[model samples]
Target: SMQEEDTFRELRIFLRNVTHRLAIDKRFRVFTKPVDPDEVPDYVTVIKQPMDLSSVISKIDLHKYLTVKDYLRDIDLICSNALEYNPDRDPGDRLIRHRACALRDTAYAIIKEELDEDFEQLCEEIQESR
Candidate 1:
């Protein structure tokens, strides 16, 4: 458990770094709000058809984690927050999508080094339960 906690702390730092890099991209500007505890929804659930994590991996450019499990929860949180904060404006949908993608990509990069199996299997399990 201690090892896992250490890994998670490292993953969080990596995520913060990746998020900052993504923020430099104009597309991610819409998700400027930091992860806020109060802003989180009352209830959040992993979708029945969970996102294909491997698909997310395919799109990322970095690599630096010990396992997907380490960062999966964080990724889910990011997506949920993006959905809640998604503005209802002309370009809001696109912006939200892009930000979500960026979050996904960041998570993938963080976890890729740690997990051996691709994310597809994990996605299937999440979807099956849903």
Candidate 2:
């Protein structure tokens, strides 16, 4: 019990660190908050499930993520919804679509780096001591 409790604390810190980076990046500015239906009335019609960095942060604060994959999926959803709602049909759509793609790529890059380098070592020590 203590082992897992301690491990999850590390997991929480790790998630917050990665999320902070994603939310602060200039390219991800628009994605930091939920889309306003008043601004884009049709957005709700096109994207059934909307996600944003602020919502994800809220989930983390609530400890809603039982595993790293759960956290990862929310981030992926944010990008997927963006791409789906903003198709490359016009200049405006293409701009948001491109930014969403970049956000997805950057998020994954950050995950891989944090997971492989920092989290990997933490897990190794955890298992070896067992």
Candidate 3:
């Protein structure tokens, strides 16, 4: 029981640190701009790829436990913490929502690994055609 409680406490602390980092990273500026019809065009695409957490786990180098675990754990922790601080139910702050989305993206990056192909493709496709 003590070990379990200790784990939970550590997790909570980890989550708090993650939320602070997410808030500070400030990567959600992308959402600030209004969508441009001329920029996007008619073909709208949506892609969702499930994360291969197991694969990530398998590839991890146990020798670098501190470095690897912190990186991965931070991603998960940040997402959870961001949701906890979600302003909709408390302060109703749009900024927090933006931060949450950004943090979620960061977490997805680690969880999903190199599967950002869709995003890269979209960016390339949407770029002004030569």
Candidate 4:
């Protein structure tokens, strides 16, 4: 259906902007790669699910996500993993963790408004098609 196609098109547009805005930022550099278990073996234990920006980009390239929720899940996971692993105890880890938090908030803020309209439009499109 045209509406379904439109939803996917909008999703791609949103993803492109996400990469343009957050993925390229200097503060987001740490999240660009997967967490190396060699460096922090306990990271896997502490974080059951690990996600990163580069992996997100790869998924986008492959058109792996069909809905906003799927993409948002990974986005949230990347930050939550950092916050969970790097508690406020250690200064260095804390700084990195804070950046993760910042990126999480920024990504949400950017994704929210655009997606709100897209969500609404998709709903209407579905109803019309029905």
Candidate 5:
């Protein structure tokens, strides 16, 4: 989609900016999973689950083709995920949280034109908290 393609472009540019803003992996390290288990077709083993066209999607990492729905999940949930698993305690935690929120921003920006009401509200709600 224009979305996934555009989002990847944003991600690459964003990652480049982050590299300049902070030292490399030294600042706050980051890794991202683009799609949920249910989002990718191969991972859906249930008969009732929706079918995802492999021609259109793949269960891949950030390095692979990412999905348009990658970060469409709740923002608080996304940040909480980053918060729980990221760098520890005072100083490092702030940087890590910031980095994680950047991902959320980029993910939503990917679908900005078509963002649902709940998604926009959640982005705002969790944004300040970020």
Candidate 6:
């Protein structure tokens, strides 16, 4: 989603600017707390918060779908189409390996939805491909 993508960029920018300002401070040479030899030290302290991955995991597990068609909507939620677009420089082998398992799953789902649902054949094909 463009919304999530924009949010990701903004968060990255925020983190970078915050880190830069802290790194430029005379008393803030390190990312974590710094030590002084003898005098009282003034340093930055970090408190971490969680990212939203927890929500997605929980949502996937807990959210109820009305129909099998609705369940396919979840397919788009997890199927990343971005890597095919925003790719590393020609990672033919790595990309195929990255995609094979995912594609294998997608294919199995499509097969179950339309064709024969015995998914073991897909698993075997995937194993041999690797």
Highest TM-score scorer: 2
**Clash list (residue pairs), candidate 1:** 66-114, 67-114
- Order the numbered candidates by TM-score, best leading: 2, 4, 1, 5, 3, 6
Clashes of each: 2, 0, 0, 0, 0, 0
Query: What's the C-alpha lDDT at position 119 in model 5?
Result: 42
Worst 10 residues of 5 by lDDT: 47-56
Q: Is candidate 2 or 4 superior in TM-score?
A: 2
Q: Which ten residues in a row have the lowest lDDT in candidate 4?
A: 120-129
Q: Which ten residues in a row have the lowest lDDT in candidate 6?
A: 43-52
| lDDT (Cα, tens digit) per residue for candidate 6, span 1-130 | 5744453344334333433433354432221222232432221122122112222234334433222333334333323322332246567635533553354364335436543223334333433454
lDDT of each: 0.50, 0.79, 0.41, 0.79, 0.43, 0.35
Could you tell me how far off, in angstroms, the CA of residue 29 lies in candidate 1 after the best superposition? 2.3
Local accuracy of candidate 4 as per-residue lDDT tens digits, 1-130: 7857777767767786786688789998889888888987887787888888888878877877766667878888888888887776788888888899899888888877667865846645554564
Off by over 4 Å in 3: 1-25, 28-70, 87-92, 110-130
TM-score, candidate 6, is 0.28
lDDT of 1 by residue, 1-130 (tens): 5744454455445545655655566655544444333654432343322332332333232433334453466567556656654546658566776678776676577556644364435433543453
Candidate 5, residue 76: the lDDT equals 36
Q: Give the TM-scores of the predictions, in the order they appear.
A: 0.39, 0.83, 0.29, 0.78, 0.34, 0.28
Give me the runs in candidate 5 sitting further than 4 Å from their true place: 1-29, 32-71, 74-78, 86-89, 114-130
Cα-lDDT of candidate 1: 0.50
lDDT of 5 at 4: 45
Candidate 6, residue 66: the lDDT equals 22
lDDT of 2 by residue, 1-130 (tens): 7976687677778888888988888988999988898998998888888899889888888877656667878888987887878766899888887888888788788877667555555655655565
lDDT of 6: 0.35
* Candidate 5 TM-score versus the reference: 0.34
lDDT of model number 4:
0.79
